[PDB]
Design a protein around this ligand. Structure first.
Ligand code: HEM
Ligand SMILES: [K+]
Length: 249
């Protein structure tokens, strides 16, 4: 259902150059997970009913999120601001989604297709809000399904975004990485989830909910056994997330 807008050749040129600059920057700064989180969270504010929120530049520097969990995203946007300034023609909305795509790529994940043309909207993110690490499967379907309009498969695949990065007790309160290789995009989120709790590693109640649900669980097993399949489903889900409300909601 996507009809992508036309952008000028100068715009496409900036996209390509920004993509390369983002690779080097994100790799050097070791901030892929924070950038993936910024992109996903920004896109994830979409609500299909009201057609509000989505990946439209609504969280930017200087951010004021202040609430538990969302802290850290202020750091992400500040980190990106000097580079963004080198590409004034790009919308913030496109720039942040491009950074999320690059974050997945430079850590070794799939190549998520990217289409430019998101407009920076006025304005802000209403919150309040939804995504709660202490809740379960019903809550997940409320957030991704009822609000965002994604499928059950997308929910499991996107949860695998936790295969890179960590929680911080000063940010959400949770603490530590999901995996032993938190800068490597692979299927280890699912293998660690299956094998139970382990010293040094984190599982949110929202991660654990995937294990108890009749639809989610077989997908967890599938992804833990077949990284290629995870990569395919992840690339599909990430593209959809990144394009919520955009080029036909
Ligand atoms: C399913 C609902 C989700 C919940 C409840 C949730 C919750 C959280 C929490 C509590 C943290 C820790 C924040 C901190 O303390 O620093 C976190 C981090 C993170 N999230 Fe999620 N998340 C969800 C979905 C997603 C999705 C869909 C993606 C991307 C596809 C994602 C990517 C990440 C990444 C990469 C980090 C690590 C950030 C870092 O290393 O600084 N999350 N998430
Ligand atoms: K990993």
């Amino acid at each position: 259902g996507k009809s992508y807008p036309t952008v000028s050749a100068d715009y496409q040129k900036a996209v390509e150059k920004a993509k390369k600059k983002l690779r080097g920057f994100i790799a050097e700064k070791r901030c892929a997970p924070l950038m993936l989180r910024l992109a996903a969270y920004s896109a994830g504010t979409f609500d299909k009913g009201t057609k509000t929120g989505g990946p439209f530049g609504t969280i930017k520097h200087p951010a004021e999120l202040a609430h538990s969990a969302n802290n850290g995203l202020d750091i992400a946007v500040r980190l990106l601001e000097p580079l963004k300034a080198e590409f004034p023609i790009l919308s913030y909305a496109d720039f942040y989604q491009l950074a999320g795509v690059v974050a997945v790529e430079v850590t070794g994940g799939p190549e998520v297709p990217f289409h430019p043309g998101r407009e920076d909207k006025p304005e802000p993110p209403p919150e309040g809000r939804l995504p709660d690490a202490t809740k379960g499967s019903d809550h997940l379907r409320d957030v991704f399904g009822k609000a965002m309009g994604l499928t059950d498969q997308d929910i499991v695949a996107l949860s695998g975004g936790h295969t890179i990065g960590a929680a911080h007790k000063e940010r959400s309160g949770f603490e530590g990485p999901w995996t032993s290789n938190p800068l490597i995009f692979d299927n280890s989120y699912f293998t660690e989830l299956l094998s139970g709790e382990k010293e040094g590693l984190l599982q949110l109640p929202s991660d654990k909910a995937l294990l108890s649900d009749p639809v989610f669980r077989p997908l967890v097993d599938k992804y833990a056994a077949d990284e290629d399949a995870f990569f395919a489903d992840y690339a599909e889900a990430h593209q959809k997330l990144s394009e919520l409300g955009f080029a036909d909601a």
